[PDB]
Amino acid sequence: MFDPAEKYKMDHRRRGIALIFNHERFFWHLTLPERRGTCADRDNLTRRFSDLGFEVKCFNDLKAEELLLKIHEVSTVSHADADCFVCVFLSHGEGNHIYAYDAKIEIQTLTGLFKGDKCHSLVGKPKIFIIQAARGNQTNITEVDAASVYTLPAGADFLMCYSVAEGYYSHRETVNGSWYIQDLCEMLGKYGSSLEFTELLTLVNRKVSQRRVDFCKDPSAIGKKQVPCFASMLTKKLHFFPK
Amino acid sequence: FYKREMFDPAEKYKMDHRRRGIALIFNHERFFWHLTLPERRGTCADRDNLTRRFSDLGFEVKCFNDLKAEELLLKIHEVSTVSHADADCFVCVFLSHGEGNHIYAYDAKIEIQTLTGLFKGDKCHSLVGKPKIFIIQAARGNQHDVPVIPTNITEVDAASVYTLPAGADFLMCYSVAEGYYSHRETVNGSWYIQDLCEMLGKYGSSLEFTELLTLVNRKVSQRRVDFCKDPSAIGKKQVPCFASMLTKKLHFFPKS
Ligand SMILES: Cc1cccnc1NCc1ccccc1O
């Protein structure tokens, strides 16, 4: 019958793939600023997800064609033996788009590759996108970017996680990494293997939104609060218990 | 514990105020002819269903039928400016058609950000740190009716309203996501609202609210239309979603 506490079956041979697309620099014609600190984010995410059982694959500064090719490749292999799929974007963005090295890519194109009829072996399984992307400004310094990327939904069993909501600001420390990724990774490390994942994301919401912007080193950044959000199309409770 | 102090993985919104709070329902069944929008038969079932479920959870429910945009704005501004100091939370429901960042009132559209903006920070100080929950059943009205002055059937409308976020401690709940379709039975009401209300009744007073919304996601996305009744509705799946800016666990336990 109908089960109020039903969980995604996470008893497969493998947890699954976690893809990370990391962008630090951009083709000069795009006139986008470098993203110092993003490599800290990449490393942090890599440890957390690998500790959760994911097979983590990182890609640095791919051109759009290369990026599309790689994600299409992954969408077309069998995930039959996997619990789930994770995809992380660390870049600048605008509207429905995230930037690769040389051009933008639509988020809907990326998520569309993992919808039911495109990726049968992921049907009914969690498909999690984590997006750290905002408006590029055209030792440890905090850079502040206006929210620009739409907090888009996707298909059933997708979970779309965004560093920042409309009207707020994304922060990135050049040594320590992004506020959002730091707090996400801290929560993953402590609670990732026990807490329901949207419960955990809610903790991240609290952590990030409570960071004070009262007295920034850069006075221009005062009052520029960060509020993350996630859009859930999940249909069951999601845990990452040790396999 | 003996007394608490640190970062708590299981922190819950404090729901021990004198009152649960206000639940606003804006119910729109018909529209000014110049808008060229179809009527929304079944929405009154949705309104009544929601009224019962939220009142059982302790909310003070106020319904408004077919308000003009100016009246709507006035009313919600009125609620945003009173003191919610004695309240746990705030709920606002829109039952209408919509487009992009807009929801239709009787005579004009209103931007969702205009509505949520009224309840941010010191615009509504007494709701700061409290759940502010918007539930939006709004999609694209099928316009095969004229620009002139004018049984249980399932109407199927394309998703049209952006699944917009808002401020901290907002929870924005949407009947349908981009690329899918919202369904409304002309007697029984909307798929989304029916399933939301059933889950509220069975689990609302114990389940964490986003967990409950996740149940609604499952219920709705698994619904099929009777192939013989409307073949055109084949492949028009409904996938709801919610955008959470919540910072704590939200329960509606019976108030003492
Ligand atoms: C068009 C849209 C679709 C879904 C969600 N939000 C959308 N627009 C609002 C918006 C603007 C800037 C940054 C984030 C953000 O969410």
Curated annotation (Swiss-Prot), chain B:
Family in the record: Belongs to the peptidase C14A family.
Region feature 130's region, mapped onto this chain: 101-118
An individual GO BP term: positive regulation of apoptotic process
A family per Pfam: Peptidase_C14
Activity control, per UniProt: During activation, the N-terminal disordered prodomain is removed by cleavage. Concomitantly, double cleavage gives rise to a large 18-kDa and a small 11-kDa subunit. The two large and two small subunits then assemble to form the active CASP6 complex. Can be cleaved and activated by different caspases, depending on the context. Cleaved and activated by caspase-8 (CASP8) and subsequently by caspase-3 (CASP3).
Keywords, in A-Z order: Apoptosis, Autocatalytic cleavage, Cytoplasm, Hydrolase, Lipoprotein, Nucleus, Palmitate, Phosphoprotein, Protease, Thiol protease, Zymogen
Enzyme class at the top of the EC tree: hydrolase
Entry's transmembrane regions: none
Top-level taxonomy: Eukaryota, Metazoa, Chordata, Craniata, Vertebrata
Protein's name in the database: Caspase-6
Gene: CASP6
Residues at the catalytic site: H97, A139
Effect of E111Q: Increased stability
PTM per Swiss-Prot/TrEMBL: Phosphorylated by NUAK1; phosphorylation inhibits self-activation. Phosphorylation at Ser-221 by AMP-activated protein kinase (PRKAA1 or PRKAA2) inhibits autocleavage, preventing caspase activation, thereby preventing hepatocyte apoptosis. Palmitoylation by ZDHHC17 blocks dimerization and subsequent activation, leading to inhibit the cysteine protease activity.
Classification via InterPro entries: Caspase-like_dom_sf, Caspase_cys_AS, Caspase_his_AS, Pept_C14, Pept_C14_caspase, Pept_C14_p10, Pept_C14_p20, Pept_C14A
Organism of origin: Homo sapiens (Human)
Gene3D superfamilies hit by this protein: 3.40.50.1460
Function, in words: Cysteine protease that plays essential roles in programmed cell death, axonal degeneration, development and innate immunity. Acts as a non-canonical executioner caspase during apoptosis: localizes in the nucleus and cleaves the nuclear structural protein NUMA1 and lamin A/LMNA thereby inducing nuclear shrinkage and fragmentation. Lamin-A/LMNA cleavage is required for chromatin condensation and nuclear disassembly during apoptotic execution.
Covalent lipid sites (S-palmitoyl cysteine): C228, C241
Keyword Protease: yes
